[PDB]
Structure formats: structure tokens, C-alpha cells
């Protein structure tokens, strides 16, 4: 519960029909992060030495 | 009366959409100028000196 996703723009697929060449091109864009409210709430374990 | 107005396009306004740079250009243009019949019809005072 401590962590969140905040989120601006979601997941869209935004296509532009390039003439001059033939292709069609399709674009993806997000908007995302992950921040927590305090600074506290995960633990690591990690191998000796 | 001894001015013109020698116009070839008003003012037009003009939307792009350049999706590859997630944009939206706007253009205006115009063709004017500014003429007169005869080489005359003109005065403007100055300041001094």
C-alpha cells in the first residue's frame, strides 16, 4: 500500500500516414512513474560479504 | 484616394498535425502591399532640428 503508480497519459497507439514514402508509421507513448508516500515500507537482502 | 490595397490572399489560418513530433503548427498568411497611382499626395511634419 505504501507505493503507487501515478499516471498522466495512458498506453495509445497514434498512427501518421507518411506519403513521400510509402510507409505508415505507428507511434506508442506513456506516461508513467512509481513513488512512495513515505520513506519507508520495502527491505533488500543481499548475499554475505 | 491615391492609395491602394493590392491583395492577392486574405488571411487564412492553417492547422498541421506533425504526429511525429506530437505538435499542432498553425500558419497564417496573407498577401498584401501598399501602392499609389502617382508620386504624390504626401506630408509629414518633424521636430525640430
Redesign the interface.
Known amino acids: 500500500d505504501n507505493f503507487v503508480m501515478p499516471r498522466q497519459r495512458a498506453v495509445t497507439v ?3 500516414r507518411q506519403a513521400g514514402k510509402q510507409r505508415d ?1 505507428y ?1 506508442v ?1 506513456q506516461r508513467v512513474n512509481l513513488q512512495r508516500y513515505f520513506e519507508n515500507g520495502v527491505v533488500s537482502g543481499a548475499y554475505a560479504a
Chains 1, 2 share one sequence.
Open positions: 497514434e498512427r501518421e508509421a507511434y507513448t
